[PDB]
A paper describes a structure:
The penicillin-binding proteins (PBPs) synthesize and remodel the cell wall peptidoglycan, a major component of the bacterial cell wall that gives the cell its shape and rigidity. In E. coli, PBP3 (FtsI) is an essential protein of the divisome, catalyzing peptide cross-bridges between the glycan chains of the peptidoglycan. The overall fold of periplasmic PBP3 is bimodular. The C-terminal module is responsible for the transpeptidase activity but no clear function has been assigned yet to the N-terminal module of the construct.
In order to determine its three-dimensional structure, the PBP388–165 domain was produced and its structure solved. The domain crystallizes in P1 with eight molecules in the asymmetric unit. The structure of the PBP388–165 domain was eventually determined by single anomalous diffraction using a selenomethionine substituted PBP388–165 crystal and refined over data collected on a crystal of the native PBP388–165 protein. The eight molecules in the asymmetric unit are organized in four pairs with, in each pair, 18 N-terminal residues swapping into the paired molecule. The swapped residues represent a two-turn helix and a β-strand that inserts between two β-strands of the other molecule to form a three stranded β-sheet. Interactions between the two molecules are numerous and include many hydrogen bonds, salt bridges (e.g. for associated chains A and C: Asp94A-Arg135C, Glu97A-His160C), hydrophobic clusters (Ile91A is surrounded by seven leucines or isoleucines from chain C), and an aromatic ring stacking (Trp92A is sandwiched between Phe136C and His160C). Together, residues 88–105 from one molecule and residues 106–165 from the paired molecule form a small globular domain whose tertiary structure, three anti-parallel β-strands flanked by three helices, is homologous to the equivalent domain of P. aeruginosa PBP3. DLS and SLS experiments carried out on a solution of PBP388–165 suggested a dimer in solution. From these results, we conclude that, at the concentration used for crystallization, monomers of PBP388–165 are absent and dimers are predominant in the solution. The structure of the PBP388–165 domain, disordered in PBP3, shows a dimerization of the domain by three dimensional domain swapping that is possible but unlikely in the full length PBP3.
Numbering used by the authors:
A (entry chain A), B (entry chain C): 88 to 165
């Protein structure tokens, strides 16, 4: 017989309880169906780096950064 | 002007891209509205321990464990 407990800090550090809304927001912003986005990210689950988009203008890139999605990163190009 | 990349291991470790379906599943398993589950978890995001349920049957507990939700734990009662 078990007790169930939550560690709110851990939920937060994984992106929050509603992080799903933000995954959808990433997909919509990039106009990549969520299923396609997920498939590409999950293809090699132990992988540490797969490109999503390139030459993304700051307006779209800042928006994506502010979603604060776990495992999502940006770098300058050129 | 940026490249956007994913880290598939960080994404998996956080519970995955479709974690939202499973947070909904947790709320259902606990027989509570998702909004109430969200409100309790969001109450203090730096908090480390809140009880979600007590004296939970072995099978229900195993279902919860298999949702693989970040920050959700089981402990044995006595």
């Amino acid at each position: 017989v078990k007790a169930i407990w939550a560690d709110p800090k851990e939920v937060h550090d994984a992106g929050g309880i509603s992080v799903g809304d933000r995954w959808k927001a990433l997909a919509n912003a990039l106009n990549i169906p969520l299923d396609q986005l997920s498939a590409r990210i999950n293809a090699n689950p132990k992988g540490r780096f797969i490109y999503l988009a390139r030459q993304v203008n700051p307006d779209m890139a800042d928006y994506i950064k502010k979603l604060k999605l776990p495992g999502i990163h940006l770098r300058e190009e050129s």
